Design a protein around this nucleic acid. Structure first.
Ligand SMILES: [Mg+2]
Lengths: 49, 115, 98, 48, 115
RNA sequence: AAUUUCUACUAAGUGUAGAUGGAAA
């Protein structure tokens, strides 16, 4: 451990009125065609960014 | 007088376009990404009946992942690849190639687009 | 027609192994899933072709490529360990790419 | 009218403009000869 | 006179209820049949804001398979088990047990109902 | 489309595969 670490903070750059999210149980699609399973249904939320 | 009606029918149009989008984004949410149709994005509601396609300020790209907002449940879309960050709210399908748009694609054809 | 093509020869001039790298094959949990990277690039290019300003649709591609030469580094530092070989790279100072 | 980032007409036009201008600047830049003997200083003066 | 507006706002209400149903039937279409919420069926549009729950002509059963019509795309529902053939068009969730309805369940709770 | 961060994702469900040297200018 070459000493001299640091600690940064960065504010939330997105306004909470802008967030986008695949809702729960909504069967999402999958982009890569070679993948055989052509959908997906998570039981929670996928908050983009 | 006559400027409370024609300032209210312009809420019937919004409340119909919201239904149209809600009815579309639930069928763009199924097609595999390589078939979704060429759309005419814009950030203000679009009446997909007339749309005056000879307008000069509307392109026709392919529509990427159709997500859904966080606070309300407005169905926001995504044009082209995602990382362009072209988050547009209302769309309307067109059989139009990039700019020389030909006509507006009816709904049932967008649904029948899966095949 | 291939982003990067690999052949590895013996001390005598036999093609020991040859293949293309349009299909980086992620190898997870025993079951392998291949993910193309040329079809992906062709789709993003056809997307640039109809984007009317392509200042942001020309950064996405310069990032995808630089995100594809960070998943071929593994398919090369795999061969090197597997064969204890040397690598042959075109010297760009004297090339005319078509 | 819109957010400049999403907007295009105020970026597509910007590009059509800056691209042509910068192409001209890139094309005329050649006329230097990089540090020589006599040249038409009446030309190179206004040129530079 | 005043009987073309108050014969038009009663189309804004219909065009809002269609959107509400379109927005619900796309989340009843996911819950497993043993969790779908107790609804208040009826064949005429229901404003889920007021609904005057003290009305005497509306029950509260559990909602079965939410299908979708054939010619148009109206989202018809099905109350209780299917073979009752109780095809109702508009619904609205309620936390109400069979008849003593308590309140109307907000949308996000119906979505949050999956768990 | 979830990431110290980037890219491609959904990869068996709050994540999978690679890569990553940051702070200054
Ligand atoms: Mg990404």
């Amino acid at each position: 451990l070459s000493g001299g670490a640091e600690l940064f903070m960065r504010r939330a750059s997105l306004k909470k009125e802008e967030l986008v999210v695949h809702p729960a149980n909504s069967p999402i699609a999958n982009k890569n065609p070679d993948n055989p399973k052509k959908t997906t249904t998570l039981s929670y939320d996928v908050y983009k960014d | 007088m006559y400027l409370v009606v024609q300032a209210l029918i312009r809420a019937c149009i919004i409340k119909e376009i919201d239904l149209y989008t809600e009815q579309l984004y639930n069928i763009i949410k199924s097609l595999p990404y390589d078939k979704r149709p060429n759309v005419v994005y814009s950030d203000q509601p679009l009446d997909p009946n007339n749309l005056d396609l000879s307008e000069p300020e509307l392109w026709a790209e392919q529509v990427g992942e159709c997500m859904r907002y966080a606070h309300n449940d407005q169905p926001c879309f995504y044009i082209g690849s995602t990382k362009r960050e072209l988050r547009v709210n209302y769309i309307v399908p067109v059989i139009g190639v990039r700019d020389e748009i030909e006509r507006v694609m009816t709904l049932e054809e967008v649904r029948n687009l899966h095949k | 027609r291939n982003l990067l093509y690999i052949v590895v020869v013996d001390g005598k001039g036999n093609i020991v192994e040859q293949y293309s790298l349009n299909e980086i094959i992620n190898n997870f949990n025993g079951i392998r899933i291949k993910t193309d990277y040329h079809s992906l690039l062709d789709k993003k290019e056809k997307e640039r072709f109809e984007a009317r300003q392509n200042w942001t649709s020309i950064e996405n591609i310069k990032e995808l490529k630089a995100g594809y030469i960070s998943q071929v580094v593994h398919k090369i530092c795999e061969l090197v360990e597997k064969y204890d070989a040397v690598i042959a790279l075109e010297d760009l100072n004297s090339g005319f790419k078509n | 009218e819109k957010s400049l980032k999403k907007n295009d007409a105020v970026v597509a036009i910007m590009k059509d403009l800056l691209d042509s201008v910068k192409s001209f600047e890139n094309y005329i830049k050649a006329f230097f000869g990089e540090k020589e003997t006599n040249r038409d200083e009446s030309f190179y003066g206004d040129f530079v």
